[PDB]
Amino acid sequence: DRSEDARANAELLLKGDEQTHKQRMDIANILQSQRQNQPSGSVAETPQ
Amino acid sequence: LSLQIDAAKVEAQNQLNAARIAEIFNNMDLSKQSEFREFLKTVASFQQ
Protein backbone atom coordinates (compact mmCIF):
# COMPACT_ATOMS: atom_id res chain seq x y z
CA ASP A 1 0.00 0.00 0.00
CA ARG A 2 2.75 2.40 1.09
CA SER A 3 4.88 1.56 -1.97
CA GLU A 4 2.04 2.43 -4.34
CA ASP A 5 1.14 5.47 -2.19
CA ALA A 6 4.79 6.60 -2.62
CA ARG A 7 4.39 6.25 -6.41
CA ALA A 8 1.13 8.23 -6.16
CA ASN A 9 2.95 11.16 -4.48
CA ALA A 10 5.16 11.50 -7.56
CA GLU A 11 2.12 11.43 -9.87
CA LEU A 12 0.40 14.16 -7.82
CA LEU A 13 3.60 16.23 -8.12
CA LEU A 14 3.69 15.74 -11.92
CA LYS A 15 0.08 16.95 -12.14
CA GLY A 16 1.18 19.99 -10.08
CA ASP A 17 3.77 20.89 -12.76
CA GLU A 18 1.27 20.21 -15.55
CA GLN A 19 -1.60 22.24 -14.04
CA THR A 20 0.69 25.31 -13.72
CA HIS A 21 1.45 25.15 -17.46
CA LYS A 22 -2.26 24.64 -18.20
CA GLN A 23 -2.95 27.87 -16.32
CA ARG A 24 -0.23 29.70 -18.27
CA MET A 25 -1.35 28.53 -21.73
CA ASP A 26 -5.11 28.95 -21.27
CA ILE A 27 -5.00 32.44 -19.69
CA ALA A 28 -2.54 33.64 -22.36
CA ASN A 29 -4.95 32.89 -25.22
CA ILE A 30 -7.98 34.39 -23.38
CA LEU A 31 -6.18 37.71 -22.90
CA GLN A 32 -4.74 37.64 -26.44
CA SER A 33 -8.19 37.23 -27.98
CA GLN A 34 -9.60 39.89 -25.62
CA ARG A 35 -7.21 42.62 -26.78
CA GLN A 36 -7.62 41.72 -30.47
CA ASN A 37 -11.43 41.72 -30.34
CA GLN A 38 -11.76 45.46 -29.73
CA PRO A 39 -9.82 46.72 -32.85
CA SER A 40 -11.51 44.02 -34.99
CA GLY A 41 -15.02 44.99 -33.87
CA SER A 42 -14.16 48.66 -34.45
CA VAL A 43 -14.01 47.91 -38.21
CA ALA A 44 -17.62 46.75 -38.18
CA GLU A 45 -18.67 44.33 -35.46
CA THR A 46 -17.62 40.84 -34.43
CA PRO A 47 -18.37 38.76 -31.29
CA GLN A 48 -15.39 37.42 -29.33
CA LEU B 1 18.77 -49.06 50.17
CA SER B 2 15.14 -48.65 49.06
CA LEU B 3 15.05 -44.97 50.08
CA GLN B 4 18.22 -44.21 48.10
CA ILE B 5 16.93 -45.64 44.81
CA ASP B 6 13.58 -43.80 45.18
CA ALA B 7 15.28 -40.43 45.65
CA ALA B 8 17.54 -41.12 42.64
CA LYS B 9 14.52 -41.33 40.32
CA VAL B 10 13.25 -37.92 41.53
CA GLU B 11 16.69 -36.36 40.91
CA ALA B 12 16.65 -37.68 37.32
CA GLN B 13 13.34 -35.90 36.61
CA ASN B 14 14.84 -32.52 37.53
CA GLN B 15 17.59 -33.18 34.97
CA LEU B 16 15.04 -34.06 32.25
CA ASN B 17 13.03 -30.95 33.15
CA ALA B 18 16.22 -28.84 32.91
CA ALA B 19 16.89 -30.31 29.46
CA ARG B 20 13.49 -29.13 28.21
CA ILE B 21 13.84 -25.65 29.77
CA ALA B 22 17.10 -24.87 27.96
CA GLU B 23 15.69 -25.95 24.59
CA ILE B 24 12.13 -24.57 24.84
CA PHE B 25 13.05 -21.11 26.15
CA ASN B 26 15.69 -20.75 23.41
CA ASN B 27 12.95 -21.22 20.80
CA MET B 28 10.76 -18.77 22.73
CA ASP B 29 13.43 -16.05 22.51
CA LEU B 30 13.70 -16.69 18.76
CA SER B 31 9.89 -16.35 18.47
CA LYS B 32 10.10 -12.78 19.76
CA GLN B 33 13.28 -11.99 17.77
CA SER B 34 11.60 -13.03 14.49
CA GLU B 35 8.58 -10.89 15.39
CA PHE B 36 10.80 -7.78 15.61
CA ARG B 37 11.78 -8.29 11.95
CA GLU B 38 8.09 -7.91 11.06
CA PHE B 39 7.84 -4.76 13.20
CA LEU B 40 10.89 -3.27 11.44
CA LYS B 41 9.33 -4.22 8.08
CA THR B 42 6.29 -2.05 9.00
CA VAL B 43 8.44 0.94 10.01
CA ALA B 44 10.48 0.75 6.78
CA SER B 45 7.27 0.91 4.72
CA PHE B 46 6.06 4.00 6.57
CA GLN B 47 9.31 5.93 6.05
CA GLN B 48 9.28 5.14 2.31
Curated annotation (Swiss-Prot), chain A:
It comes from the Viruses. It is found in: Virion. Homododecamer. Interacts with the terminase large subunit; this interaction allows the packaging of viral DNA. Interacts (via C-terminus) with the head-to-tail adapter protein gp4; this interaction participates in the head completion. Interacts with the scaffolding protein; this interaction initiates procapsid assembly, thereby ensuring incorporation of only one portal ring per capsid. Interacts with the capsid protein. Forms the portal vertex of the capsid. This portal plays critical roles in head assembly, genome packaging, neck/tail attachment, and genome ejection. Procapsid assembly may initiate with a nucleation complex composed of portal and scaffolding proteins. The portal protein multimerizes as a single ring-shaped homododecamer arranged around a central channel. Switches upon genome packaging from an asymmetrical conformation in the procapsid (PC-portal) to a symmetrical ring in the mature capsid (MV-portal). This change of conformation may serve as a signal for headful packaging. Belongs to the p22likevirus portal protein family. This is Portal protein. It comes from Salmonella phage P22. The chain holds residues 678 to 721 of 725 of the full protein.
